[PDB]
Structure formats: C-alpha cells, structure tokens
Amino acid sequence: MSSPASWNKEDFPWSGKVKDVLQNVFKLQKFRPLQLETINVTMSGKEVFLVMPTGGGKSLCYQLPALCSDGFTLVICPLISLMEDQLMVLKQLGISATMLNASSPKEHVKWVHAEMVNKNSKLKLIYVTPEKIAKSKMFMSRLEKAYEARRFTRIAVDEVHCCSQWGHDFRPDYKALGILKRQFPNASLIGLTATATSHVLKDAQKILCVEKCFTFTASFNRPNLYYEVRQKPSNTEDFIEDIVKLINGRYKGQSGIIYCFSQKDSEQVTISLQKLGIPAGAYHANMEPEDKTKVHRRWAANEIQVVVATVAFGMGIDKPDVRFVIHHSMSKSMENYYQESGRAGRDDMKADCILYYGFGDIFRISSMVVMENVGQQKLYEMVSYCQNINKCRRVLIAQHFDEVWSPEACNKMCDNCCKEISFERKNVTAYCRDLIKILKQAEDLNEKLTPLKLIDSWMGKGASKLRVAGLAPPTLPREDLEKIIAHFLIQQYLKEDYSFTAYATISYLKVGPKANLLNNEAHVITMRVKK
Ligand SMILES: Nc1ncnc2c1ncn2[C@@H]1O[C@H](COP(=O)(O)OP(=O)(O)O)[C@@H](O)[C@H]1O
Ligand SMILES: [Mg+2]
Ligand SMILES: [Zn+2]
Secondary structure (H helix, E strand, C coil), rough: CCCHHHHHCCCCCCCCHHHHHHHHHHCCCCCCCCHHHHHHHCCCCCCEEECCCCCCCCCCHHHHHHHCCCEEEEEECHHHHHHHHHHHHHHHHHCEEEECCCCHHHHHHHHHHHHCCCCCCCEEEECCCHHHHHCCCCHHHHHHHHCCCCCEEEEEEEHHHHCCCCCCCCHHHHHHHHHHHHHCCCEEEEEECCCCCHHHHHHHHCCCCCCCEEEECCCCCCCCEEEEEECCCCCCHHHHHHHHHHHHHHHHCCCCEECCHHHHHHHHHHHHHHCCCCCCCECCCCCCCCHHHHHHHHEEEEEEEEECCCCCCCCCCCCCCECCCCCCCCCCHHHHHHHHHHHCCCCCCEEEEEEECHHHHHHHHHHHHHCCCCHHHHHHHHHHHHHCCCCCCCHHCCCCCCCCCCHHHHHHHHHHHHHHCCEEEEHHHHHHHHHHHHHHHHHCCCCEEEEHHHHHHHHCCCHHHHHHCCCCCCCCCHHHHHHHHHHHHCCEEEEEEEEHHHHHHEEEEECCHHHHHHHHHCCCCCCECCC
C-alpha cells in the first residue's frame, strides 16, 4: 500500500474549493483520516484505491470531487438499495444526483440519457448497476458521447472487491468494467472497499486495467471501542430483560444498535424492547427509501434510542454518536463482527461493543451457513473468540486484518484486559470418552443426536434407549456441560453433521476426526477455565 503522507496537504490547486465544498455543501468541519489524501489523488486525475472500514466515510471521497469537477462522476454500485441510500443523503444536501437500473421507467431513462450529454446539466453523480455497462447498448452509447462532450470525467467503483470472484458478493458483471478505464482513459478511476486482502485488491486492479494505482489503507484499529463478550441466557424473554437492564444501567438515553441474526429476530426484539420501555426501531437493507429516512430522523431526534439491525448485506445505519453496539447473536465471521461492531464511536469518544455468546447459536448459525464452503470454519473462529479468556480481544480481531491493523496497545479497552482473573487447566478426557460411547451407541441404533439429545443422554435423561447402561451422569451445571461440548467441537474431538428437512437445516453431533487420539491412554484433553 502507498504512503499517503505526501498527499495530506491543503495546498493543491483545488484545496480552496475542496475546503469550501466540504464545509458549505456537505456541512462537515474536518476530514477523517485518508479522506483528504484520497480526494487529492483523484483531483489530480490519478487512479486511487481506498481501503476503509464500513462507516469510515468512503462515499465522501468520490462525492466531493464530483462537486469540484466538471461534468459528472459515474458510480458503479452493486445494489439498488445502496444507490438509494446515497441519493437520500445527496438530496438533503442539495446535490443533483440520479440512478439507473434495469427497472427504471422509460421517462426517467430518457431524461438521464439527455442530461449526460447536456453540457449545462446539474447532474454531478450518476449511479448505475454493472448491468448498465455489460448489458445496455444504449447507455454505453450515451457514455461515449458524454466522454466526447468532456462531461464523463470520473469513475467510482463502489465495493471494488466485487470485481474479483475471490472477494465476497462477487458479481460476474463486474468483470466487464475494465472497458471504462481502457477506452475512456481521461476519466480517472477510484475504487472503494472495506475488504483489505491484497489478493482481491490487486486482482481488482488488473480487471479494471488500473494497475498503475495508488492504494491507501486506513487504520482498522478503533482505540476508543471497548470489546466485551457476555454469556447469553437460554430463555429469550430472560435475555432481552438483561439487555434492557444493561442499556438502562450503562447507556441511559444514549443511542445504540442491536444486531440480530434474522429479520424475524429483528422485529421481535424491537417490540419486546418497546414494551419494556426502550424506544426501539427496526432497520433493514431492503426497506423502502421513505421508511429508512424515518428510522434515521426518529433516531436523530432521539425518538428511538435503539436501532435493531438485520446484519446481512446492504446496511444503512451509520450515526456518529452510537455509544453501544449489542450483538444479539454472534456474527458469521470475525471480519463481519469487526465491521458490524465498528459502527460504534464514530465521534471518537468511548463506545462499547457487546457480543452475546450462546451455545445454541453455534448450531443455529452453523446450519444457516451450510452452503458456504468456509462458513463453518469462519463461525468456529467466532466461537473461539467468544471462548477466549486469556488474550486481549483486540489482538484476536487484529489477526484477521494483518495488513491494515496497527500493533497499538489496547490499554484496558476490552474485557479480557480489564478483568483481574487467573486461569487453570482441568482434565476433561473422561468426559469425552463418555460422549463418544453415547455417540457410538446412537450410531449403533441408527440414531442422530442433536446437542440437546446428547446432553440429555449424558445427564441420564431423555429417551432411555439412548442412555448408555453404565454411564454415571457428569453432575456438572448444564452450562459447564455446554462449554465442554463446544470445546470438543472446536478441537474436533466432535464434529457437526447436518440433516435437511422440508423447511430447516438441523445440526447433529458425531464423533470427530481427533477422537482416535483417545485410543492411546497417554492422551489428555484439558480446558482453560477461570480460577
Ligand atoms: N469527514 C467527515 N466528518 C463527519 N462525518 C463524516 C465524514 N465523512 C463521512 N462522514 C459520515 O460517515 C457516515 C458513513 O459514511 P459512508 O460514506 O456511508 O461510509 P462507507 O461508505 O465507508 O461505509 C455518513 O453518515 C457520513 O455522513
Ligand atoms: Mg459505502
Ligand atoms: Zn485488550
């Protein structure tokens, strides 16, 4: 990645206008890190790639230059919901911008087509789907003339990782985008993404034919964020009571976000918060634009304290003063978790990131990500993070962001650095052999054991048929039995198997690949616990 220090200056020719447009049109007082550098590179007509976390402020880096340049900037965007999110903001600021998608009405397409070639048009930003480049003969016809008229002057590729089929949410239509820079070279190109992997970034640059490219990356470390993991109560009505007690005891009246696994969870959580006296409001990526705005302003007016989020792709939410982010369930991955929790403490004042870990969420999420070849591997990394008690949470998160994360000290800004505990290891070897005897007897009976069934059989309950004759129940509190089973799962003395029913995927436990090690009595399985 390039060094941006040589660009962090306000003595370029356009600096006076950029400063003007920032304060008087966008109503912002200061640039966030790498905003001015990226803007300066684009304004000199050079290619730049900006790696910046979600909610960092990447949009400004192509919106502002559009307003300080002639003609319009073409913004390639993967979803209509993202385009609408942008046009909502641009409308309130007084900026003329529009969008084009496959469904857009005849009257609107003819208007945009005319404005593109109209030398006197106010249109500064045209958002399109990659289908408008790949599969629309006429739009490319209007771009070629707009380039002829010196009006098509910049290209912005939002979520530029999508150009690589290695990067998440890849669109095949993004591979066609290389024609823009190749054939319309005087249009400068800026690529925005939150994903740091150098392989997806260098592949994207080849695809876009922009290999002569400045790459700027932000510090992904957010030192003002406090990371914490809490145990999730089995009873969901019990659970939201604890959430309300936590919000009232720590963040009374402060705005916050709650992330939920599902949309049904999202709205159920919303109404249970409203009944218990927390003004809440649900937000979803595919909501209609006029709904999204009301959630935002009601949030801004503090008519709703908490916004209940839905975590999957296309999130709107960002507010600068979010004091807490609660994850109702763990994320699908560490990379997802960092980004989602990262919406806290924009204002650079202290904010908390609360992750609620539940034994049952291991199998609920695992079953949902069956069709992602690495889904289970990424989820187990999240579980291991939840299970960790002896390491700084910031160290664990940083290991997923090698290139983009500073060694900078945590300074007691995570629960593991603040809690004054010591640890000891305990033997769990005989527990594992008990579980394997139960799982092989179930295998002899042609029976598949869910986690619930296995614990029951282990404790001496459930179907007598699945109980092993001589097994003495472990007589530990059920939460410790759950911690034991999850440890064996992550360590692969047990593994997950799946059943597909008419409406759901159901996870089952089976003997794991490392259980052979217990045939040698020398092998000892241990767990780290709190002393
Ligand atoms: N220099 C700045 N000062 C204050 N707020 C900013 C600045 N730049 C961006 N923002 C705000 O940050 C929020 C998220 O910006 P956005 O461009 O959506 O981030 P990204 O696209 O990187 O996810 C927006 O509400 C925007 O107004
Ligand atoms: Mg964005
Ligand atoms: Zn720490």
